Amino acid sequence: AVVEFAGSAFEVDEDGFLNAFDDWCPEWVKYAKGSEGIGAGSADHQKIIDFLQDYYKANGIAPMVRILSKNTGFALKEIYELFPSGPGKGACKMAGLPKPTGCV
Amino acid sequence: AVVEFAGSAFEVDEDGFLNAFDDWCPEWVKYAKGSEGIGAGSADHQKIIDFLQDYYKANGIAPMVRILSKNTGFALKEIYELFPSGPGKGACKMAGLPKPTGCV
Amino acid sequence: KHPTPMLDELEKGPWPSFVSDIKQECDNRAKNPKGLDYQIPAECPDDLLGILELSFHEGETHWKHGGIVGVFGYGGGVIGRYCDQPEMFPGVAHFHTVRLAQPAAKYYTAEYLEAICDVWDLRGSGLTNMHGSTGDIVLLGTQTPQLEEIFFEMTHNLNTDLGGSGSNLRTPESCLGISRCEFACYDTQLMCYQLTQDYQDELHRPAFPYKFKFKFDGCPNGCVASMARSDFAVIGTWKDDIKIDQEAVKAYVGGEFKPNAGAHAGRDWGKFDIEAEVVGLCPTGCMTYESGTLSIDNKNCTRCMHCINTMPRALKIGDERGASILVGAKAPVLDGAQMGSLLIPFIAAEEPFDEVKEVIENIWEWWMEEGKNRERLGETMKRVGFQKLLEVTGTKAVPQHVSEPRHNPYIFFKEEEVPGGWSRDISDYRKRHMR
Amino acid sequence: KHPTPMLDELEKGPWPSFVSDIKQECDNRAKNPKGLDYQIPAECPDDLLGILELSFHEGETHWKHGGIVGVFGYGGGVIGRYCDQPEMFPGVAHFHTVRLAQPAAKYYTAEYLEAICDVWDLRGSGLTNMHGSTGDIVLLGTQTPQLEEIFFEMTHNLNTDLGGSGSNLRTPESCLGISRCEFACYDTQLMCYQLTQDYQDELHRPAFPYKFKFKFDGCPNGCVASMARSDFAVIGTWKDDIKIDQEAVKAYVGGEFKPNAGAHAGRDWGKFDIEAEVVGLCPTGCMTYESGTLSIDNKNCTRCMHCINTMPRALKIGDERGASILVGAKAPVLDGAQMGSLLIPFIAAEEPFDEVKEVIENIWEWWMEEGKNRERLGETMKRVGFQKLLEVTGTKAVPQHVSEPRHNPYIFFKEEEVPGGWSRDISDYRKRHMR
Amino acid sequence: AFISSGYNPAKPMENRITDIGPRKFTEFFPPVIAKNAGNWDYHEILEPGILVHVAKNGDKVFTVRCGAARLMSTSHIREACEIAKKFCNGHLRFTTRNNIEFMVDNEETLKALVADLKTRKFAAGSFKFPIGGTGASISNIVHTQGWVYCHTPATDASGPVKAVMDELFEEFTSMRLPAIVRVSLACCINMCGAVHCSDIGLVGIHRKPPMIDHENLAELCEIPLAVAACPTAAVKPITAEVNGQKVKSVAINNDRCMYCGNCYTMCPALPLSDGTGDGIAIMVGGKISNRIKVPSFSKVVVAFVPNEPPRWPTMAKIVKKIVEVYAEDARKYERIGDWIHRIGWETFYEKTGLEFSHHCIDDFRDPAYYTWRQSTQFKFVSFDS
Amino acid sequence: AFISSGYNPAKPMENRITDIGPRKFTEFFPPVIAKNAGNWDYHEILEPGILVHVAKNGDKVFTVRCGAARLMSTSHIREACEIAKKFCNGHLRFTTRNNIEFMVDNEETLKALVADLKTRKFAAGSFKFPIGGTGASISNIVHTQGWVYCHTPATDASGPVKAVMDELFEEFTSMRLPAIVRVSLACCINMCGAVHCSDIGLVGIHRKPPMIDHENLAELCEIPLAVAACPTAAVKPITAEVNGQKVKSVAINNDRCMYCGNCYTMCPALPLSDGTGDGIAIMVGGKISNRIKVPSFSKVVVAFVPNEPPRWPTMAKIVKKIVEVYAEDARKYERIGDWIHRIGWETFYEKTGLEFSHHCIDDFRDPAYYTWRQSTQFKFVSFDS
Ligand code: SRM
Ligand code: SRM
Ligand code: SF4
Ligand code: SF4
Ligand code: SF4
Ligand code: SF4
Ligand code: SF4
Ligand code: SF4
Ligand code: SF4
Ligand code: SF4
Ligand SMILES: O=S([O-])[O-]
Ligand SMILES: O=S([O-])[O-]
């Protein structure tokens, strides 16, 4: 499907992840916000999103949870406070990274 | 010891192999001739010497006997007719490569 | 209802047919006796058979790759799935599975299961698995919007959580243990329950390099197959003498008591020959029968359970009980299948199980930091080495840790163990050894 | 030189002392009874004691790395060596080893060995190894200039060639076979001799990716250990029935004939018990002893040799003989030790041995082209696969080829074996299976 | 149409309960079990599918084990419940092999329960609660999702399992084998469940390399993971050009690929399922218990049989053949693996009539060497003729 | 003087004879052997070191086996020849374990030969031709070069062999063991000879990474060969400096290095021998015959014992203890490996009193897993206390 928001269009799949990382933009985050239980984006939310994007651009993969926490300084518990759906379904989705894979 | 021949000096070990490949010179071949049972150097001789030299510079190791024969087109029998001591003790020594190692 | 020629063939035969059962549920939702307002298409089950029938024809699955769905607060418990012919089978377009935490050894009361069914019939397909291979009650098929609803009902009304999925601790499971077995060396169900409750955060939220499972067996016979299907297996045993009742032994030799409690009854094997069926089958040959008197050299008994399994009424487990911890089991991918390897030969197993929890946490602390992405504990063990595992768990290496010692000589030593260390000057060596 | 407190300790004790022997040769050369004009220093052995004594004090070898010497026409046969303290021990400045080709199973005449000793006393140290582990007679220690002189004498006056060394075929050796053993299934010495002669060129001139060894055992007992120390092991066996002489069996049972030909006479193991020492030890349990008669269910006999070894007067090998071919044995370096893996269960083993030779040449054709630099056949088998080895030798896969079938499902198939091949269009698939 | 639970999607985190885990088992215990747990004296198998446990104080609990399809409707579950409310005071349980056990405290109730169970069948004819699975028999088959729910299967689960249990039904309702025979199935090499440690294991396998959707791959996939997912390093990152467009992708060396499908598990753009290519591999000789002999992995004896919906005749016949030969030739207490270890592999093949192929010879890494035969010990069989 | 053989260094290829191989064994056979080869009926071990083979036609050949040091002088060889000419018509042979065998055709000559052999001793005391090595005994030790000739040893060969045979001499001259006990030694991990398949194996090992001679390495070494020579991939190519200048060399990651020395075998600029660091690893349980049980590799039971010239007491003592415990506990026909497979490793260590260390647990590649214990089967031993 194709999402229309703030004059922007984002192609997405059945789970709401962007079809193409390059179509990411700030409007996407404002769009996804509520779906992922976030009322207002904070400086911390953006620091997570920023990290995830730089890591993906550099490594071609999403960072392991231990790296995400160790780098941002946010423990897993804090990461869930920021993103209720978790680092995968919430943070990665909002950051524009592709849908997690493997067994589960 | 240092071989003194034709105004040139070549550092060698007890078995007559050049200590440094970079010290190789055409006179080296003329020096080692008789010791390797070779009275006259033919084009076929140089062809082998040239291949060993290029292979060594490019790969950092002496070529496998199979490769030596395949490229030069000389079977092992011919190789020995050219270098009575064999591709190792004979050709490699004459080509300036380092002494062969391992279990014999 | 679709035509289902091939599935119909599976309604034939004596074994309970899943097709006949699914069809019965289709009929039920069609009549809707209860007048539910089905939150997903009443014809959901009708479509699963329709798409299953298509798969029989074509020889290929009709589910799209993957899916990422869940409930807030958790990073798993729900396996998302979408059919790849949503126009043909609208009722399985979304067909998610919800993994529900089950009671240890799966003991239930009708009231409880019926309550779960009431919620499911409403919000899902009507279809289940009883039970998933890890252990969970599997609720097979629903739509995304129902998830939060289900989860809310399950917690507020049924005081039941989701099971686990993903790169985390999965649902633990135990054999029935002391509930119904005279071989149980510890309360497997209690340990299973206690550790499931203790480690909830680790089960609901992915913090690990990969998946991790706990399984608890009451004795070596392996009724929950811990040593095969869990990364950390706790298997009961004893350290004192097997209890022998000579008179019962006589009851066996005589025919009054049936061998293996009657397990081979369906066939005529001859009369019981204690020598041929017990003493002569003992792996260590530590048993003896002389003058109508059975005895056991326990020092040389490996507690394989054979004699006990064969003469349950005459031979009992010891009284000094505990368990063994075997780790690393996993299926083939990537690097090959593994069964659990013995780590702690004997450890206490009494509530609140601290010794065992200590081992679990020491392993996690190490593996969490050292394990590579998507690398199972067993594979980390192969890469880094069994000796590292010992070190991090504070376990002394013993002969019991091997089935055989190494036959290569590529032995690693710690610098500190070597006099002089590893810093050497080749200059001094050359003093003794001319180039 | 020359005082040797540590080595002197090794002159004590019952076992023949190599030090006392080396000292005897030192004394013989110093005295020079035959007035020989030693072509290397008479004190050579003396300096060998001295440098050895120094190694004993320092716990470190005193030989320089490697050495490349030899005779014209060959690429191997001599292992050059130079001591690392030339000034201290001039007698062993050069201390080359010459490997001499030995007669199969090492049968000798005094005239021949004396002839060899005459050449070595004059041109060598007077020290030898009888024999090196591969089989060669080893002339231990000489100088470079003597290599061609020794070779000239050996070939022209003793009709004896050098053995092998380097990346080629090494000196083949066999058990004594039919020369003095009633268990021999084929003429191991003859096969050894003929093949050594047939492949002289492969032995003297390195044309292989690495070293390669042949070893011939007359039966599974492995007296030359071909299965552990050769890349190509030929081990004799039979295809028909073991021969049983009941009169001889009764002689064993009665004590007239001693079990294992008296190999356990130094201890009281009690009277021979055929049931406990033979029937009960057979690995397949294919033997029967009833009413005083011994029988063997040959179909289930793996011909392990135990019963024959234990009652050699009563039980004989069959008359339909041949051999098995096992390949790939090697020491650990690099990828781990290997023993021979069964390739050809049964093959003809009679002169001119065309059958065995065909297998050898087929393996070389493949390995000489596919083996990597310094890769033993056994390692090529590991890298490329056993199946490849079967192909190249035209051998049909049989259950006998495995000790156990694989337990991983990573099965490769040939494209031509799969209907439709491997060319598939994703667009067509995607018409059945939407993204 | 929407009926809420009380959940407020506008305030998702309010009132959320987490980490309560499962209900405690003890809640669910029938009285006799709760009272005598840990004090059992002995047990006895009375008949096929019927056990009794006797406590040290004398109390007894009778158990009736029944077969189940694992995949079941709420109506069926319901039915199990009804039975429990009628004869077991509402109590029941499920086994590690997905059988349903019903428990009562007296023989009279036991006889009434059994008689009833025997009368329950679907309209089509199959038994709803067949009694058995105890002792030396063939209990339920441990199995997976198959085409009912998974995206990576190479075969189905429920279908095959039914087909096989029908053929082995007599082995479930009787105790006439030398020892228990565990049969398990997995629809793909990930091997969920028990196939790798069962007496007879069935594994879905592929025979064709995956198709690569070059056009969308980088978009859909984290390339490094697909590369790392390959056990044989057949996947490599590349810069592809599709319809004149430059995109990152991967290349697969079909020569190194053995169709495990792990790359597909990690990347939706490498699908590999195929109707004629896919099938089942048959394994034998594994076990999990430590009784007499140590546990062992099942071994591949038949590399490939084809998928033949709906009753997989070829595969089913082979399974029945193996069970038949084993039951006849194995000694008391010998598991299939124990039996094979005793007679040897060439004899196993001679006796079963199974075709041995080179595909069964291990070729995966260093450990494959240990599976070859390093001994002269072998028996002459039809193979060598 | 220069005493020429006839060879001409000016025309080396003149008169050159090549590819003639060894002499044929038939030329050196005793007549009794030549005549009856292939027609042997049976054999009997008359006493320690003395055998008799009887041909079908009644002919007999008696064999006397004598221990020998392998490393020997021409004088010793000549003495063996003197004996052969005196009693054996000039014939003798050597065994695959380097013992000497004298053969005669009658009992009178056999008695004379035996009486003769016993009188031959070196001045310093040792027997020159000790009779034995037959049946269930310890017959010589297959060994290597050691410090007598090799550049890659981690220990000596001849010295330790003399030390061990002295302490086990009573086992060479008698047949009191449960089965043959083969002892072998190798001075480095190349394991020339028979270590990896012996009942008791001794291997020289290092405990320190090699030293790197940067100034000459590039000149003297084929870098890639050194890199590919490492089993644990601990070697890699790097830029180093010599006299403030850049050069090509190698770097060794000490944490991946297990001191095998294979890189030194391929490169003279990476020496690693060390007086205090080097020692011996003790292995047990291997065999090559196929009698009853299949062949097997020896396993490391004591990771390290120091080198202690000239008699290696620590090592000698351990070898003696293993033989004593084995001879006392094993059953008839049981090889050391067979015995251990029966009693178990934990019992082996308990009975021998040997200290088990983590160093004996395999950690080399994937096959290592198989060496661990995948079973609950174990016996309680002092280890666990
Ligand atoms: C002399 C001898 C030992 C002895 O005292 O008996 C010997 C001596 C050497 N062997 Fe060997 N090997 C000897 C039998 C063996 C055997 C046993 C056999 O052949 O029956 C083996 C095990 C079987 C095998 O082939 O693996 C053996 C496996 C090795 C290896 C390990 C090869 C491997 O693939 O793992 C090496 C190291 C290498 O090749 O890189 C080696 C290396 C060496 C070298 C050439 C070391 C070197 O780099 O120069 C040794 C020379 C010592 C010297 O100074 O003379 N030697 N070597 C034996 C050969 C003499 C002969 O002409 O009769
Ligand atoms: C539902 C269940 C099969 C069943 O029908 O019973 C199952 C289903 C799946 N398993 Fe599992 N596994 C199930 C028990 C197991 C077991 C057995 C056990 O836990 O007792 C194993 C073997 C033990 C182990 O952990 O290795 C198992 C080993 C795997 C593997 C192989 C992992 C490995 O390290 O080798 C995978 C593949 C992977 O993780 O990459 C996998 C992958 C999968 C996935 C998640 C495939 C995917 O990529 O999404 C399957 C989802 C199917 C679906 O659509 O629902 N599943 N899986 C079982 C779990 C349900 C439940 O919560 O109680
Ligand atoms: S594993 Fe041992 S304790 Fe648990 S149900 Fe099975 S027999 Fe009983
Ligand atoms: S449990 Fe197993 S090891 Fe111990 S006595 Fe009984 S049969 Fe022997
Ligand atoms: S390998 Fe067999 S034929 Fe050869 S000498 Fe030894 S027991 Fe006799
Ligand atoms: S040779 Fe070995 S397998 Fe054949 S009958 Fe004798 S003991 Fe049993
Ligand atoms: S075995 Fe493979 S195909 Fe079947 S459920 Fe598990 S992952 Fe899905
Ligand atoms: S299917 Fe398996 S073997 Fe083939 S490329 Fe994918 S991961 Fe590698
Ligand atoms: S074992 Fe090592 S050190 Fe001893 S002779 Fe063979 S190569 Fe040299
Ligand atoms: S000694 Fe062996 S482990 Fe250490 S770097 Fe050299 S070759 Fe690799
Ligand atoms: O579902 S699997 O990951 O156990
Ligand atoms: O000489 S060794 O390589 O056999």
PDB file of C-alpha atoms in Angstrom, chain F residues 167-250:
ATOM      1  CA  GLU F 167      61.828 -49.302  33.284  1.00  0.00           C
ATOM      2  CA  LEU F 168      59.572 -51.527  31.166  1.00  0.00           C
ATOM      3  CA  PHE F 169      62.254 -54.118  30.416  1.00  0.00           C
ATOM      4  CA  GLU F 170      60.487 -56.811  32.450  1.00  0.00           C
ATOM      5  CA  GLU F 171      57.482 -56.343  30.147  1.00  0.00           C
ATOM      6  CA  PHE F 172      59.618 -56.905  27.040  1.00  0.00           C
ATOM      7  CA  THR F 173      61.020 -60.212  28.307  1.00  0.00           C
ATOM      8  CA  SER F 174      57.669 -61.646  29.426  1.00  0.00           C
ATOM      9  CA  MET F 175      54.116 -62.122  28.159  1.00  0.00           C
ATOM     10  CA  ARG F 176      52.036 -61.184  31.213  1.00  0.00           C
ATOM     11  CA  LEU F 177      49.890 -58.357  29.792  1.00  0.00           C
ATOM     12  CA  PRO F 178      46.167 -58.596  28.906  1.00  0.00           C
ATOM     13  CA  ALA F 179      47.159 -57.778  25.324  1.00  0.00           C
ATOM     14  CA  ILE F 180      49.992 -56.107  23.430  1.00  0.00           C
ATOM     15  CA  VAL F 181      50.842 -52.603  24.578  1.00  0.00           C
ATOM     16  CA  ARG F 182      52.367 -50.492  21.829  1.00  0.00           C
ATOM     17  CA  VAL F 183      54.369 -47.491  22.993  1.00  0.00           C
ATOM     18  CA  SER F 184      55.422 -44.806  20.513  1.00  0.00           C
ATOM     19  CA  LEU F 185      57.187 -41.462  20.671  1.00  0.00           C
ATOM     20  CA  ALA F 186      57.351 -38.476  18.317  1.00  0.00           C
ATOM     21  CA  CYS F 187      59.503 -35.415  19.065  1.00  0.00           C
ATOM     22  CA  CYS F 188      57.017 -32.846  17.726  1.00  0.00           C
ATOM     23  CA  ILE F 189      53.378 -32.594  16.650  1.00  0.00           C
ATOM     24  CA  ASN F 190      54.195 -33.672  13.091  1.00  0.00           C
ATOM     25  CA  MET F 191      53.937 -37.011  14.873  1.00  0.00           C
ATOM     26  CA  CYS F 192      56.137 -39.024  12.558  1.00  0.00           C
ATOM     27  CA  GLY F 193      55.626 -42.592  13.274  1.00  0.00           C
ATOM     28  CA  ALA F 194      52.888 -44.072  15.309  1.00  0.00           C
ATOM     29  CA  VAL F 195      51.854 -41.890  18.211  1.00  0.00           C
ATOM     30  CA  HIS F 196      48.386 -41.198  17.090  1.00  0.00           C
ATOM     31  CA  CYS F 197      47.521 -44.914  16.953  1.00  0.00           C
ATOM     32  CA  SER F 198      49.363 -46.396  19.944  1.00  0.00           C
ATOM     33  CA  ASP F 199      48.267 -47.722  23.342  1.00  0.00           C
ATOM     34  CA  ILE F 200      50.647 -45.187  24.901  1.00  0.00           C
ATOM     35  CA  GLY F 201      51.912 -42.251  22.874  1.00  0.00           C
ATOM     36  CA  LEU F 202      54.458 -39.611  23.727  1.00  0.00           C
ATOM     37  CA  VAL F 203      54.572 -36.322  21.792  1.00  0.00           C
ATOM     38  CA  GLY F 204      56.898 -33.374  22.166  1.00  0.00           C
ATOM     39  CA  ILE F 205      55.004 -30.091  22.420  1.00  0.00           C
ATOM     40  CA  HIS F 206      55.796 -26.390  22.808  1.00  0.00           C
ATOM     41  CA  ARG F 207      54.129 -23.841  25.118  1.00  0.00           C
ATOM     42  CA  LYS F 208      55.407 -20.567  23.648  1.00  0.00           C
ATOM     43  CA  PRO F 209      54.637 -18.729  20.378  1.00  0.00           C
ATOM     44  CA  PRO F 210      57.472 -18.479  17.863  1.00  0.00           C
ATOM     45  CA  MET F 211      59.946 -15.609  17.768  1.00  0.00           C
ATOM     46  CA  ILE F 212      59.802 -13.518  14.585  1.00  0.00           C
ATOM     47  CA  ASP F 213      63.056 -12.608  12.841  1.00  0.00           C
ATOM     48  CA  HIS F 214      61.774  -9.567  10.940  1.00  0.00           C
ATOM     49  CA  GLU F 215      65.107  -8.607   9.380  1.00  0.00           C
ATOM     50  CA  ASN F 216      65.402 -11.854   7.394  1.00  0.00           C
ATOM     51  CA  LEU F 217      61.869 -13.248   7.209  1.00  0.00           C
ATOM     52  CA  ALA F 218      60.915 -11.764   3.818  1.00  0.00           C
ATOM     53  CA  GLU F 219      64.141 -12.924   2.376  1.00  0.00           C
ATOM     54  CA  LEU F 220      64.047 -16.416   3.696  1.00  0.00           C
ATOM     55  CA  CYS F 221      60.321 -17.127   3.685  1.00  0.00           C
ATOM     56  CA  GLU F 222      57.462 -17.617   1.332  1.00  0.00           C
ATOM     57  CA  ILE F 223      55.025 -15.540   3.378  1.00  0.00           C
ATOM     58  CA  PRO F 224      51.811 -17.126   2.032  1.00  0.00           C
ATOM     59  CA  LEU F 225      53.132 -20.585   2.928  1.00  0.00           C
ATOM     60  CA  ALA F 226      53.626 -19.456   6.526  1.00  0.00           C
ATOM     61  CA  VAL F 227      50.127 -17.981   6.665  1.00  0.00           C
ATOM     62  CA  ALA F 228      48.490 -21.111   5.222  1.00  0.00           C
ATOM     63  CA  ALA F 229      50.562 -23.291   7.574  1.00  0.00           C
ATOM     64  CA  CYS F 230      48.674 -22.173  10.673  1.00  0.00           C
ATOM     65  CA  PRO F 231      45.825 -24.506  11.764  1.00  0.00           C
ATOM     66  CA  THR F 232      44.343 -21.718  13.893  1.00  0.00           C
ATOM     67  CA  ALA F 233      44.831 -18.824  11.443  1.00  0.00           C
ATOM     68  CA  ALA F 234      47.136 -17.033  13.894  1.00  0.00           C
ATOM     69  CA  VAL F 235      49.553 -15.782  11.210  1.00  0.00           C
ATOM     70  CA  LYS F 236      49.015 -12.850   8.984  1.00  0.00           C
ATOM     71  CA  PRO F 237      50.996 -10.585   6.661  1.00  0.00           C
ATOM     72  CA  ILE F 238      52.112  -7.198   7.988  1.00  0.00           C
ATOM     73  CA  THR F 239      54.516  -4.345   7.400  1.00  0.00           C
ATOM     74  CA  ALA F 240      57.390  -4.258   9.870  1.00  0.00           C
ATOM     75  CA  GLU F 241      60.568  -2.228  10.152  1.00  0.00           C
ATOM     76  CA  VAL F 242      64.201  -2.998   9.976  1.00  0.00           C
ATOM     77  CA  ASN F 243      66.524  -0.227  10.564  1.00  0.00           C
ATOM     78  CA  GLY F 244      63.879   2.317  10.358  1.00  0.00           C
ATOM     79  CA  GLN F 245      62.845   1.010   6.938  1.00  0.00           C
ATOM     80  CA  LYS F 246      59.645  -0.725   5.828  1.00  0.00           C
ATOM     81  CA  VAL F 247      59.675  -4.472   5.173  1.00  0.00           C
ATOM     82  CA  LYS F 248      57.289  -7.300   4.548  1.00  0.00           C
ATOM     83  CA  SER F 249      56.849  -9.665   7.456  1.00  0.00           C
ATOM     84  CA  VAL F 250      54.274 -11.493   9.573  1.00  0.00           C
TER      85      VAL F 250
END
